[PDB]
Design a protein around this ligand. Structure first.
Ligand SMILES: [Ag+]
Length: 329
């Protein structure tokens, strides 16, 4: 499966690094407003995930990563990309600028077969999260992988709902710093709080990742919404799911249910741990949701507080390839 990446940002670079560890997905073309010499630098060195495992050179204005040529372009218009020349099947849309079917279809016009958005769709484009609704894919040409927080809350909420039933849920993600925020109190027209100093503040932020669970899980629609807190960590976030259960269940029964799915139908997606883990213990975690058993707490048999870790970069990126590989079946 030849895959072309549009937008060599944080998600774009981690999708590239995760593809080097897979055999069914091969990156063949990258497009961003950067020269080839700069793209080789942002791949070779990474402050969060260390140096790149492999070789990377620049020749003829193109990258040579692990002895494989990769076409580099800087087309601002998605239709002028000419994916026919390099032969791309699925385009990884990782710019955040084209999150609609009208704007993402320019890759189909440019010579691609399918498009996967690395973000929550802004229109009626269907969103798919692994372990939640990957079976509901009906061969659409443009899909979406929702958000990274949705890829963490949906697999956990599905197991809790299928076992005990969620009447109403209220979540909160202690999120890490992203490239949206500022290092120092700067301007931010869309979000005033987001313009404050990231390394100095606990910045509240609104998110619709919990309300988006109702789209990938129609049985939980209108039963989930939440918020966020941006904290001065470079990577790895954690959600705080607070749900009211329909069936009475103890915490030891909740741990056994999450552990059964972690070792069963949701292996590789929903993780499970009983260790004294912290955030940096999940830097580079492939799982999109790791349930922290000792961190959670319950008030009674029908009101519990669940804790689940997730990497907002590595975990979501690996599930972008999993969505590319699923639509290609
Ligand atoms: Ag996130």
């Amino acid at each position: 499966i030849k895959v072309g990446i549009n937008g060599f940002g944080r998600i774009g670079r981690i999708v590239f690094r995760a593809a080097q560890k897979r055999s069914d997905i091969e990156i063949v073309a990258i497009n961003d407003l950067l020269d080839a010499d700069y793209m080789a630098y942002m791949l070779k060195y990474d402050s969060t995930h260390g140096r790149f495992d492999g070789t990377v050179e620049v020749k003829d204005g193109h990258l040579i990563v692990n002895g494989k040529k990769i076409r580099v372009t800087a087309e601002r218009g998605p239709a002028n990309l000419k994916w026919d020349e390099v032969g791309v099947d699925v385009v990884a849309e990782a710019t955040g600028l084209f999150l609609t079917d009208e704007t993402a279809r320019k890759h189909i016009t440019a010579g691609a077969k399918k498009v996967v958005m690395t973000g929550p769709s802004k229109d009626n484009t269907p969103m798919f999260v692994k372990g939640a609704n990957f079976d509901k894919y009906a061969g659409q040409d443009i899909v979406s992988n929702a958000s990274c927080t949705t890829n963490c809350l949906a697999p956990l909420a599905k197991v809790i709902n299928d076992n005990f039933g969620i009447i109403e849920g209220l979540m909160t993600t202690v999120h890490a710093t992203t490239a949206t925020q500022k290092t120092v109190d700067g301007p931010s027209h869309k979000d005033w709080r987001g313009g404050r100093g990231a390394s100095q503040n606990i910045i509240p932020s609104s998110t619709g990742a919990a309300k988006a669970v109702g789209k990938v899980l129609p049985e939980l629609n209108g039963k989930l919404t939440g918020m966020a807190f941006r904290v001065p960590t470079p990577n790895v976030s954690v959600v705080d799911l607070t749900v009211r259960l329909e069936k009475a269940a103890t915490y030891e029964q909740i741990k056994a249910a999450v552990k059964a799915a972690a070792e069963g139908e949701m292996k590789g997606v929903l993780g499970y741990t009983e260790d004294d883990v912290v955030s940096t213990d999940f830097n580079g975690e492939v799982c999109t949701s790791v349930f922290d058993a000792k961190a959670g707490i319950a008030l009674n048999d029908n009101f519990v507080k669940l804790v689940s870790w997730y990497d907002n970069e590595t975990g979501y990126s690996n599930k972008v390839l999993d969505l590319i590989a699923h639509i290609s079946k």
